[PDB]
Amino acid sequence: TKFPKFSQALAQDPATRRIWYGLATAHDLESHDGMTEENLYQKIFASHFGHLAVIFLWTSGNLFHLAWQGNFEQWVLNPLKVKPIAHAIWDPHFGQPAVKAFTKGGVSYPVNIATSGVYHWWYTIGMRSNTDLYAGSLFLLFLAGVFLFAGWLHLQPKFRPGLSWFKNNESRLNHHLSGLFGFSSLAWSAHLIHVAIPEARGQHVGWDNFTKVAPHPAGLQPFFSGNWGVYAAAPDTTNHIFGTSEGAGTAILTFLGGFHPQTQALWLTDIAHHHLAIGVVFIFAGHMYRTNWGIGHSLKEILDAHRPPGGRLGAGHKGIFETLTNSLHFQLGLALASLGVITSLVAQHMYALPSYAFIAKDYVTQSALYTHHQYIAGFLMVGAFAHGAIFFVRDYDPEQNKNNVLARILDHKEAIISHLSWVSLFLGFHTLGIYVHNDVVVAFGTPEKQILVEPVFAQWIQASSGKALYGFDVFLSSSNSVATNASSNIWLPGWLEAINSGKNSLFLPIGPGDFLIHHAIALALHTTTLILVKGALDARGSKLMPDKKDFGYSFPCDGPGRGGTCDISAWDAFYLSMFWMLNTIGWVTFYWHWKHVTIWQGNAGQFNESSTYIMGWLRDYLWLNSSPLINGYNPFGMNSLSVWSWMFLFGHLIWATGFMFLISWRGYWQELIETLVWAHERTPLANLVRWKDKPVALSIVQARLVGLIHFTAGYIFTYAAFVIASTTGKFG
Amino acid sequence: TLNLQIPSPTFEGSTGGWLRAAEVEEKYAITWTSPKEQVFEMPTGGAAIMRQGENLLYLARKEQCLALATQVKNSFKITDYKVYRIFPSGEVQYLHPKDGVFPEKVNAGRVGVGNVSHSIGKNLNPAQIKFTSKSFNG
Amino acid sequence: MTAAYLPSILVPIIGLIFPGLVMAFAFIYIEQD
Amino acid sequence: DVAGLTPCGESKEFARRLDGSVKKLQTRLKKYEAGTPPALALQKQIDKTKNRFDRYGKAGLLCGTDGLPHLIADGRWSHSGEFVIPGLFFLYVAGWIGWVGRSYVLFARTADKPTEKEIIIDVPVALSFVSTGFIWPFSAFKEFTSGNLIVPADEITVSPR
Amino acid sequence: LTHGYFLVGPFYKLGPLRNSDVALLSGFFSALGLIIILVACLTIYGVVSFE
Amino acid sequence: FGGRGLGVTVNAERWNGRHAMFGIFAMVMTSYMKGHGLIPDADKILDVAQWGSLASVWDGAGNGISNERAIILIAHVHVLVVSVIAAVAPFGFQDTLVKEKGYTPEAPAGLIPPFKTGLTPEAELINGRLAMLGIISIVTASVFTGTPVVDTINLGMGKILY
Amino acid sequence: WLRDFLWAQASQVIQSYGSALSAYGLIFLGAHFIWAFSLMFLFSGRGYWQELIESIVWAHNKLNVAPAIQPRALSITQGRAVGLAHYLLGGIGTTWAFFLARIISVG
Ligand code: CLA
Ligand code: CLA
Ligand code: CLA
Ligand code: CLA
Numbered sequence A: 001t002k003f004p005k006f007s008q009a010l011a012q013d014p015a016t017r018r019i020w021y022g023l024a025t026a027h028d029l030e031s032h033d034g035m036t037e038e039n040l041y042q043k044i045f046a047s048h049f050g051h052l053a054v055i056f057l058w059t060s061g062n063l064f065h066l067a068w069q070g071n072f073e074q075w076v077l078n079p080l081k082v083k084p085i086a087h088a089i090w091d092p093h094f095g096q097p098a099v100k101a102f103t104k105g106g107v108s109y110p111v112n113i114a115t116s117g118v119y120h121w122w123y124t125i126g127m128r129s130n131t132d133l134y135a136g137s138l139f140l141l142f143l144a145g146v147f148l149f150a151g152w153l154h155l156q157p158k159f160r161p162g163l164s165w166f167k168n169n170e171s172r173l174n175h176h177l178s179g180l181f182g183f184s185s186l187a188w189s190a191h192l193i194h195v196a197i198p199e200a201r202g203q204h205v206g207w208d209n210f211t212k213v214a215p216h217p218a219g220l221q222p223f224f225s226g227n228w229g230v231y232a233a234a235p236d237t238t239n240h241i242f243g244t245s246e247g248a249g250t251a252i253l254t255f256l257g258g259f260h261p262q263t264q265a266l267w268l269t270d271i272a273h274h275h276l277a278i279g280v281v282f283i284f285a286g287h288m289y290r291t292n293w294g295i296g297h298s299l300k301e302i303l304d305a306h307r308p309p310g311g312r313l314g315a316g317h318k319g320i321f322e323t324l325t326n327s328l329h330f331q332l333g334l335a336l337a338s339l340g341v342i343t344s345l346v347a348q349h350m351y352a353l354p355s356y357a358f359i360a361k362d363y364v365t366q367s368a369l370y371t372h373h374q375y376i377a378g379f380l381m382v383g384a385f386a387h388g389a390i391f392f393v394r395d396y397d398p399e400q401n402k403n404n405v406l407a408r409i410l411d412h413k414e415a416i417i418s419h420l421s422w423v424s425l426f427l428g429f430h431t432l433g434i435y436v437h438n439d440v441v442v443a444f445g446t447p448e449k450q451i452l453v454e455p456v457f458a459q460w461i462q463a464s465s466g467k468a469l470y471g472f473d474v475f476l477s478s479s480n481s482v483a484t485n486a487s488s489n490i491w492l493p494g495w496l497e498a499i500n501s502g503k504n505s506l507f508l509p510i511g512p513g514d515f516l517i518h519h520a521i522a523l524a525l526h527t528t529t530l531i532l533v534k535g536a537l538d539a540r541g542s543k544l545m546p547d548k549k550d551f552g553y554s555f556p557c558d559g560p561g562r563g564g565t566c567d568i569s570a571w572d573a574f575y576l577s578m579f580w581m582l583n584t585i586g587w588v589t590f591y592w593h594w595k596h597v598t599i600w601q602g603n604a605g606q607f608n609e610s611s612t613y614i615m616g617w618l619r620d621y622l623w624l625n626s627s628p629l630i631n632g633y634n635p636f637g638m639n640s641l642s643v644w645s646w647m648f649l650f651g652h653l654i655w656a657t658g659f660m661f662l663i664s665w666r667g668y669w670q671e672l673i674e675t676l677v678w679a680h681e682r683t684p685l686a687n688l689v690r691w692k693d694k695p696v697a698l699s700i701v702q703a704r705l706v707g708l709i710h711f712t713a714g715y716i717f718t719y720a721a722f723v724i725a726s727t728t729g730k731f732g
Numbered sequence B: 001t002l003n004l005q006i007p008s009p010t011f012e013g014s015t016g017g018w019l020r021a022a023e024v025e026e027k028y029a030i031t032w033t034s035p036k037e038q039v040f041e042m043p044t045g046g047a048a049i050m051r052q053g054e055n056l057l058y059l060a061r062k063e064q065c066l067a068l069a070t071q072v073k074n075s076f077k078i079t080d081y082k083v084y085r086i087f088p089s090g091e092v093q094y095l096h097p098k099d100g101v102f103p104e105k106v107n108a109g110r111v112g113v114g115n116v117s118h119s120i121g122k123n124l125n126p127a128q129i130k131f132t133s134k135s136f137n138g
Numbered sequence C: 001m002t003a004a005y006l007p008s009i010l011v012p013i014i015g016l017i018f019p020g021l022v023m024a025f026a027f028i029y030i031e032q033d
Numbered sequence D: 001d002v003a004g005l006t007p008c009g010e011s012k013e014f015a016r017r018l019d020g021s022v023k024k025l026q027t028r029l030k031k032y033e034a035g036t037p038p039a040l041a042l043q044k045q046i047d048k049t050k051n052r053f054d055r056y057g058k059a060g061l062l063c064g065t066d067g068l069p070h071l072i073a074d075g076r077w078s079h080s081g082e083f084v085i086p087g088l089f090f091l092y093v094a095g096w097i098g099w100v101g102r103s104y105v106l107f108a109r110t111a112d113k114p115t116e117k118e119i120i121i122d123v124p125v126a127l128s129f130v131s132t133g134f135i136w137p138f139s140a141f142k143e144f145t146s147g148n149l150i151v152p153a154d155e156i157t158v159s160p161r
Numbered sequence E: 001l002t003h004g005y006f007l008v009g010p011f012y013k014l015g016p017l018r019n020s021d022v023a024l025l026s027g028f029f030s031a032l033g034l035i036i037i038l039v040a041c042l043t044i045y046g047v048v049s050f051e
Numbered sequence F: 001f002g003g004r005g006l007g008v009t010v011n012a013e014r015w016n017g018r019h020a021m022f023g024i025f026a027m028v029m030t031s032y033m034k035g036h037g038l039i040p041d042a043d044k045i046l047d048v049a050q051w052g053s054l055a056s057v058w059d060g061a062g063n064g065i066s067n068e069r070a071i072i073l074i075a076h077v078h079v080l081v082v083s084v085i086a087a088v089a090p091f092g093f094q095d096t097l098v099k100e101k102g103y104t105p106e107a108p109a110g111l112i113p114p115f116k117t118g119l120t121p122e123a124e125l126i127n128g129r130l131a132m133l134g135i136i137s138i139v140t141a142s143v144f145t146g147t148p149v150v151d152t153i154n155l156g157m158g159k160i161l162y
Numbered sequence G: 001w002l003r004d005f006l007w008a009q010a011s012q013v014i015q016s017y018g019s020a021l022s023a024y025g026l027i028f029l030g031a032h033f034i035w036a037f038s039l040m041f042l043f044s045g046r047g048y049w050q051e052l053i054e055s056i057v058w059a060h061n062k063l064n065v066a067p068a069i070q071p072r073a074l075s076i077t078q079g080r081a082v083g084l085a086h087y088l089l090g091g092i093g094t095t096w097a098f099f100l101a102r103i104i105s106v107g
């Protein structure tokens, strides 16, 4: 058996555990036999190339499947009535009524209705026909092939980079900030000015004419003259019909603010100046570090020099440079945390300030996008903490970090965990007490006895942004404030028009239910942070197991001795925190979907009166919106929601299956497999057939992971089916 | 040496006995002497009656043999038991007691295997021994 | 749908022939000594 | 008023809530004979509902558009009895409770067998301790400043870092 | 012969084309596909099991 | 893989050449019958109510596979069943598809094998390579012009078939 | 089963608020709470809770309020038993409230 060629210990396993553990440790290159650091970095570089190629192939596949089987050319003409098609259906297990019921979108074959929002994004950036969609798919296929060839090439001899090249922090930071962030943003601003804005104004720009069709009538002469404000003159009129010249302006760079009154999305000129400014700022950031020419900053000197002289941080940040450069897991945790924060930021800011034309009226698409990127955010943050725990297990050198900030985290880890526990118990005790209190007093016929705290802090913030609903009369809601007079000539009219109109999701009105659900969200975030931080900081050892770092990041237990040591590793803390992450994104998406459905229905008072107690959530959101989902198929017929009606139940099945690997444990199943081995060995006409690997029960860590996987898949598929089918049944 | 001609305890048979891996990979044997014919519990499930005199028994695992040895030690005061490992080629490897003296009693000539010359809290952190074949013990 | 024969050609291939050969060859690879 | 809310004593939807509750209790009252104990119980429930709505309307509570009282908790004194002053009452009691429990723990260490004191409470000594809690902030602060509340880090067990 | 002979029956009697005029042809073709799958199973078993 | 006669081996080239000669024959005979109208109900659309959901193609008119395409596919299914049975249960005298691990590989014939006319393996390999090259050329001439493959074969043969 | 039995007949227990059967709805929610609380014992293990109890013991040691009886996490068998007991209580109480509210309302 030589499948796990990277592990001799796994390859000598005589049982079925070998295949599973080779599958689960295949990409754990640091644990492989005889792995050196240079080989590790080169394999990581090529794997990153392969993932980039996979992303490009997926995007090219989306573009191609739309150019072939979509209705983009029909959808551009009538964006607010035509249902967008994701891809075609060819399933031979279908009966005829299922073929009939999925034939939508103005085509003659069964199709799925798109929820990804690629129509609005591609239409906003200037694609109009199916031809350029196919050309973009071809370009991304070619780009993916180029990156596959680069991944092969940069592993070939005399091209394999050295460890000094990989650990060049200053050069990589300068090039990735100035070029990968800055010049990419400048080029996207260029694409918006040169292509997207003219196509938004009904004038065709492609590769055949973009060198002869000026983005602005005055050309680049106002840019080279320093009369840049000429590019701000004659913006798009409030009567502008998107994709046509009727009411179109000539400006290419404005900061008008608010939304286009027809598309209910941000002005494209604002997006172009934003990405231009982001490019300029990032190129200015990308000249900061010294690479070859004496000027620039040194990262080691900046880290060592910022030690506060009062001694409250100890030695400050001395040794953090080598600890960060030498540990890929510390870097991975930092990157995953920052990525999770910004995809949460994307999820909040894109529903609140949409940039794609007509996507604010596509309720299913907004729900799917928010839910998707928020679940991605939870996964990324959990991964950040998990790989930080791996950094403490594998890479943390105390002797290189004497009196460091990391060492001082470790020296007051008990205070951190105890105060996290205190705030988690505080939040849970009083939030659950208010919710149960409201339930009990509403059930007894006295809703006037509820404890309803007005969220005056966030309402004050909304008034500071210009919301005149609450009468706070402060900052942008004050017509005499210095901020109001400062911004009155630039952006205040459009922003005030967008924030004080109740037709969008810009700073939606909030009440006691919003207060309670944000404090529940704070409870869940603090508790997940408690589990993850306690796992990371106790990863090296505890009072029950002071030599945990000798046993690695993942192991089942330390035996029944010393009272019992079940789930003591930091991997087990990851495993416990995954449920709480699913709970937190569940609460967030429940709040988002119920509030947005009640506003879209014109029945926001139902949310305002029912969200203060749990029975309102169970009845008016879960039970009430389940009716089109559970009627996707029935004894009277079926319709297009039936697949979600299947998938919903599918989730309710697979979620439950996870429980069996999380409740029942190993020895029972192992003895059953002994009985099955005896049965197969003693049965005639079947003992002629022999297994090559001995059948064994799944290991403890493997069973925890498999139960987690079935649980998580059920969670995701159940909520996705519910949100899409419910939004479609109410609004589509 | 293992005498293959030692008679076995009287057993009616069970489904818990050794599988094909005993005749293919390895098998274990336990011998002991009893002062009388008496009923004992099989480690694979069931009751057997051991004869007066010598008894030879075959098992699939060493732990089953040592469980039987512990059972007859604490219930019948039998300490002369010997456990052997038998391969399909017929080579017999004596296992327990390895030097004739039980492992809980000190015997001369035994050498310490796996002994570490410091406390467990003096083990190395993984960061010293990453990308290096040095042991965590030092 | 232009080239409508392609779904009916490729979906049975991708869904039954590709996984069967992948499972067979992966089985052969992981069980061989 | 605060945050665009209206006082409950002039809110028409607060009156609609009161009227709906009164009619809901009165339609149950209609099915019973006058003088029967269910009729008296229902009339008492009506009286409690009217008194509660009257008391809530004259208290300066703010009502939202739902028709329920909304609490203000930003620190302003005009609603200082809605969160700040009851919370201090809890702060009075809870700081009491822990302190007397802490005192009992310091007593229990001095006994011959502490764990028997832990499971079997010395009731006179515990009653003395629960009497001591009425001046708990000043006593706790003097315990803190004399170095008898906080122990140094070198006398507390910690795991290997 | 025995197993392939009895494999025809359930596919003919219970398949999705059982109420059509080509029920037996579809059932035999499905049985042949199952036979080919089992032959592939035999082939990979013999490849991995014996030297 | 390579030790069993699979991959770039002389056996695999010979087998693909044999299959390519048969493919040239099948395309020519298909073109001859399709030009001459020997396919009964060639434009008949197969109905889902008889043949099930596998007959769905989802084109713009009829939404069913034509009867002619089904007849061509069933003709191929016959020789696929023959292929499977010959691959698993070959004749004792027949050349086998997969070879044993300790087999002797046939020597590569280079640019051109020795000119042995008749039912010799050299002539078989020469027409097999010729048939593979002809299939490549026919495919390229079909996709660079828009001419259908049957019509391309008829034009390259000078309208002999029809 | 999901729609015509579970979804359909639970209308009575979730609209019982403000009526005499509202206690069943409260119990319905409470059983829904406790059963989920049971999974915290069922899915987790002793070592995590023992180390968290170590941190809480450090917190109580900082204020010199550590008890003489050393707090330990519940045993593995006790963890299984507590999770099973709260699971059974939650499920039986949920079915209890749902059945009783439905059959009192419609029968
Ligand atoms: C200017 C030169 C330049 C540029 C452009 C890059 C570019 C890149 N390098 Mg890099 N590199 C450079 C110089 C450069 N390098 C130098 C000089 C060195 C040596 C010191 C290295 C050493 C190096 C290593 C060692 C690695 C890379 C990697 C990467 C890739 C990161 C993955 C990726 O695509 O993220 C794309 C990222 C961006 C486009 C910017 C970040 C985007 C953020 C999240 C904001 C975007 C939000 C926005 C609203 C989304 C809009 C889109 C939405 C509509 C869908 C990327 C292609 C990694 C890789 O994958 O290798 C193949 C890697 O491991 N580089
Ligand atoms: C009236 C209804 C009500 C009810 C039933 C509860 C119930 C509870 N509260 Mg609570 N609380 C309420 C209203 C209520 N609260 C209000 C209105 C406030 C605002 C002032 C608070 C503020 C509050 C805090 C700040 C804490 C609680 C805690 C608790 C829990 C433990 C009780 C306790 O203190 O242990 C008995 C006391 C001890 C065992 C030791 C004494 C510790 C006390 C709390 C210190 C008080 C003095 C200290 C100097 C003040 C520090 C507060 C500072 C951080 C702002 C319990 C479930 C505690 C908790 O959840 O723990 C995580 C907790 O820390 N509550
Ligand atoms: C609804 C289910 C539920 C509930 C209520 C809890 C509750 C708790 N979990 Mg938890 N957990 C759950 C499911 C649940 N878990 C699941 C499914 C998992 C995945 C395995 C986890 C994983 C998990 C981890 C990994 C951690 C927790 C932690 C916590 C505690 C702090 C969080 C909090 O809000 O404190 C507030 C506490 C509550 C709201 C609990 C309810 C308190 C009750 C209502 C008080 C009244 C009791 C009542 C009077 C008793 C009378 C009964 C008698 C008559 C018989 C708390 C005890 C963390 C912890 O211990 O932090 C200190 C921690 O580290 N849990
Ligand atoms: C990852 C991207 C992706 C995905 C999920 C799909 C999904 C689908 N395609 Mg599609 N396709 C894609 C890219 C993709 N396509 C690209 C780039 C092309 C251009 C060559 C096509 C061309 C295409 C045709 C012509 C047809 C489909 C069809 C289908 C459907 C049936 C599956 C099938 O027969 O595949 C067949 C797909 C191929 C033969 C092309 C391979 C797909 C790309 C190139 C590979 C991507 C792999 C990925 C990056 C790595 C995965 C690793 C691991 C997870 C396995 C299904 C909805 C069929 C359909 O319409 O049924 C209704 C059909 O007839 N596809």
Ligand code: CLA
Pocket (backbone or CB within 6 Å): A092, A093, C011, C012, C013, C014, C015, C016, C017, C020, C021, C024, E011, E015, E016, E026, E029, E030, E032, E033, E034, E036, E037, E040, F051, F052, F053, F054
């Ligand atoms: C994406 C993959 C995929 C595809 C393309 C199909 C396609 C089909 N399934 Mg299906 N199926 C799938 C996945 C898939 N299934 C999965 C995952 C399951 C498990 C839940 C099932 C369970 C299932 C059942 C239980 C049944 C079908 C049936 C059918 C057929 C529909 C009825 C009909 O007209 O056929 C008429 C039937 C035929 C024309 C027989 C086709 C025989 C093929 C062509 C022989 C090929 C053998 C093999 C692939 C050769 C290569 C071997 C190699 C892989 C080792 C159709 C061919 C029905 C059927 O008729 O099957 C008998 C049926 O009863 N399926």
Ligand code: CLA
Pocket (backbone or CB within 6 Å): A418, A419, A421, A422, A425, D097, D098, D099, D100, D101, D102, D104, D121, D126, D127, D129, D130, G055, G056, G059, G060, G063, G065
């Ligand atoms: C003598 C009582 C006492 C005191 C003063 C403290 C003090 C403290 N505890 Mg602790 N605790 C206690 C009992 C006590 N504990 C008991 C009995 C339990 C088991 C339920 C806990 C469980 C516990 C947890 C799980 C946590 C704390 C935490 C804390 C700290 C913050 C305050 C807090 O969260 O309170 C909240 C207190 C509770 C939730 C439990 C209180 C239970 C009752 C109400 C107190 C016992 C009163 C006692 C019976 C009176 C008898 C005396 C009489 C004979 C005179 C602080 C060091 C937290 C921490 O680490 O913060 C830094 C934290 O996470 N404690």
Ligand SMILES: CC1=CCCC(C)(C)[C@H]1/C=C/C(C)=C/C=C/C(C)=C/C=C/C=C(C)/C=C/C=C(C)/C=C/C1=C(C)CCCC1(C)C
Pocket (backbone or CB within 6 Å): A330, A332, A333, A334, A337, A338, A341, A381, A384, A385, A387, A388, A389, A391, A532, A533, A536
């Ligand atoms: C555990 C593990 C061990 C070691 C490795 C590891 C990776 C380090 C770690 C994992 C760690 C975790 C994951 C670390 C990652 C952690 C979390 C996610 C950091 C969140 C930071 C939020 C910043 C401070 C800002 C908000 C904006 C502020 C400045 C604004 C104010 C203002 C701005 C200007 C604008 C307007 C708003 C107002 C308020 C007016």
Ligand SMILES: CCCCCCCCCCCCO[C@H]1O[C@H](CO)[C@@H](O[C@H]2O[C@H](CO)[C@@H](O)[C@H](O)[C@H]2O)[C@H](O)[C@H]1O
Pocket (backbone or CB within 6 Å): A218, A219, A220, A221, A222, A224
């Ligand atoms: C001491 C140094 C002072 C500053 C020096 C650098 C100033 C900026 C230099 C810009 C680059 C050179 O600019 C030179 O080529 C440009 C492109 O053909 C010309 O620009 C012209 O053509 C462009 C392309 O059609 C049009 O969009 C412009 O509206 C038009 O003015 C400039 O009129 C010319 O001066």
Ligand SMILES: CC1=C(C/C=C(\C)CCC[C@H](C)CCC[C@H](C)CCCC(C)C)C(=O)c2ccccc2C1=O
Pocket (backbone or CB within 6 Å): G040, G041, G042, G044, G045, G046, G049, G072, G073, G074, G075, G076, G078, G079, G080
């Ligand atoms: C939460 C949890 C614990 C922690 C439970 C603690 C250790 C015991 C809690 C008992 C409390 C103290 C008694 C009842 C709580 C009352 C509501 C308030 C306490 C009253 C005090 C005066 C005692 C485990 O020990 C455990 C063990 C094995 C698997 C899973 C778990 C597990 O999930």
Ligand code: SF4
Pocket (backbone or CB within 6 Å): A556, A557, A558, A559, A560, A564, A565, A566, A567, A700, G045, G076
């Ligand atoms: S029950 Fe399982 S996880 Fe717990 S100590 Fe025993 S073997 Fe380890």
